[PDB]
């Protein structure tokens, strides 16, 4: 679609799992930083990692990007899940002034017991 990103509404986890989110966007952002942001206000949102504009792997604590600039999705990978990890999050791109954002909501289940 034309929305500049869009994501999955929401993504689910386990407990000392794994998770993985799509964040598609539209061609003509190609070379633009992208970036998952945590939490509210939306615009206040803390950054957990961010591209600088090239497919390379980014990797900052427990999060991971990788920009795909021929099918126009980055992939974000949550690991080690923690049960505080869940809550409200953004697929962002970066530019100047009002970023494209799209919110997904993080759901973690615990490990059964
Ligand atoms: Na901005």
Same mark, same amino acid.
């Given at each position: 679609?034309?929305?500049? +990103? /869009? =994501?999955? !509404? !929401? +993504?689910?986890?386990? !407990?000392?799992?794994?998770? %993985? @989110?799509?964040?598609?966007? /539209?061609? =003509?952002? $190609?070379?633009? $930083?992208?970036?998952?942001?945590?939490? *509210?206000?939306?615009?206040?949102? $803390? %950054?957990? +990692?961010? /591209?600088? #504009?090239?497919?390379?792997? *980014? $990797?900052?604590?427990? @999060?991971?990007?990788?920009?795909?600039?021929?099918? &126009?999705? &980055?992939? *974000?990978?949550?690991?080690?899940?923690?049960?505080?990890? #869940? =809550?409200?999050?953004?697929?962002?791109? /970066?530019?100047?002034?009002?970023?494209?954002? &799209?919110? @997904? %909501? +993080?759901?973690? =289940?615990? *490990?059964?017991?």
């Amino acid at each position: 679609m034309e929305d500049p +990103v /869009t =994501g999955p !509404e !929401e +993504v689910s986890g386990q !407990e000392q799992g794994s998770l %993985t @989110v799509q964040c598609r966007y /539209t061609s =003509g952002w $190609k070379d633009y $930083k992208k970036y998952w942001c945590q939490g *509210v206000p939306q615009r206040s949102c $803390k %950054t957990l +990692v961010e /591209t600088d #504009a090239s497919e390379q792997l *980014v $990797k900052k604590n427990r @999060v991971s990007i990788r920009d795909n600039q021929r099918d &126009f999705i &980055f992939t *974000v990978t949550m690991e080690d899940l923690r049960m505080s990890d #869940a =809550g409200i999050y953004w697929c962002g791109i /970066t530019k100047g002034g009002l970023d494209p954002m &799209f919110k @997904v %909501t +993080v759901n973690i =289940g615990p *490990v059964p017991t």
